Structures are given as structure tokens and as C-alpha cells.
Amino acid sequence: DVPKSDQFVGLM
């Protein structure tokens, strides 16, 4: 699935 770094930048 999507990278965890995507969920971090998502909000950030």
C-alpha cells in the first residue's frame, strides 16, 4: 500500500 511517509506528509 501507500508508504508510511505518505501518511506523515499527508497531514504535514
PDB file of N, CA and C in Angstrom:
ATOM      1  N   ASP A   1       0.840  -1.185   0.000  1.00  0.00           N
ATOM      2  CA  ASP A   1       0.000   0.000   0.000  1.00  0.00           C
ATOM      3  C   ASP A   1       0.885   1.248   0.000  1.00  0.00           C
ATOM      4  N   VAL A   2       0.251   2.384   0.248  1.00  0.00           N
ATOM      5  CA  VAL A   2       0.965   3.650   0.279  1.00  0.00           C
ATOM      6  C   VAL A   2       2.040   3.595   1.366  1.00  0.00           C
ATOM      7  N   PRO A   3       3.096   4.432   1.174  1.00  0.00           N
ATOM      8  CA  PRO A   3       4.190   4.488   2.126  1.00  0.00           C
ATOM      9  C   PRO A   3       3.778   5.243   3.391  1.00  0.00           C
ATOM     10  N   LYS A   4       4.397   4.861   4.499  1.00  0.00           N
ATOM     11  CA  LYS A   4       4.105   5.491   5.776  1.00  0.00           C
ATOM     12  C   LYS A   4       4.513   6.964   5.717  1.00  0.00           C
ATOM     13  N   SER A   5       5.442   7.252   4.818  1.00  0.00           N
ATOM     14  CA  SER A   5       5.925   8.612   4.651  1.00  0.00           C
ATOM     15  C   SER A   5       4.846   9.474   3.993  1.00  0.00           C
ATOM     16  N   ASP A   6       3.878   8.798   3.395  1.00  0.00           N
ATOM     17  CA  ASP A   6       2.786   9.486   2.727  1.00  0.00           C
ATOM     18  C   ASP A   6       1.769   9.954   3.770  1.00  0.00           C
ATOM     19  N   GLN A   7       1.603   9.133   4.797  1.00  0.00           N
ATOM     20  CA  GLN A   7       0.669   9.450   5.865  1.00  0.00           C
ATOM     21  C   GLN A   7       1.241  10.549   6.762  1.00  0.00           C
ATOM     22  N   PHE A   8       2.558  10.685   6.711  1.00  0.00           N
ATOM     23  CA  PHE A   8       3.238  11.689   7.510  1.00  0.00           C
ATOM     24  C   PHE A   8       3.169  13.063   6.840  1.00  0.00           C
ATOM     25  N   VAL A   9       3.348  13.055   5.527  1.00  0.00           N
ATOM     26  CA  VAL A   9       3.308  14.288   4.758  1.00  0.00           C
ATOM     27  C   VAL A   9       1.851  14.682   4.509  1.00  0.00           C
ATOM     28  N   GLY A  10       0.988  13.676   4.530  1.00  0.00           N
ATOM     29  CA  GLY A  10      -0.430  13.904   4.309  1.00  0.00           C
ATOM     30  C   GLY A  10      -0.953  15.028   5.206  1.00  0.00           C
ATOM     31  N   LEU A  11      -0.694  14.879   6.497  1.00  0.00           N
ATOM     32  CA  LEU A  11      -1.131  15.869   7.466  1.00  0.00           C
ATOM     33  C   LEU A  11      -0.159  17.051   7.456  1.00  0.00           C
ATOM     34  N   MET A  12       1.123  16.721   7.484  1.00  0.00           N
ATOM     35  CA  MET A  12       2.159  17.742   7.478  1.00  0.00           C
ATOM     36  C   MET A  12       2.075  18.599   6.213  1.00  0.00           C
TER      37      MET A  12
END
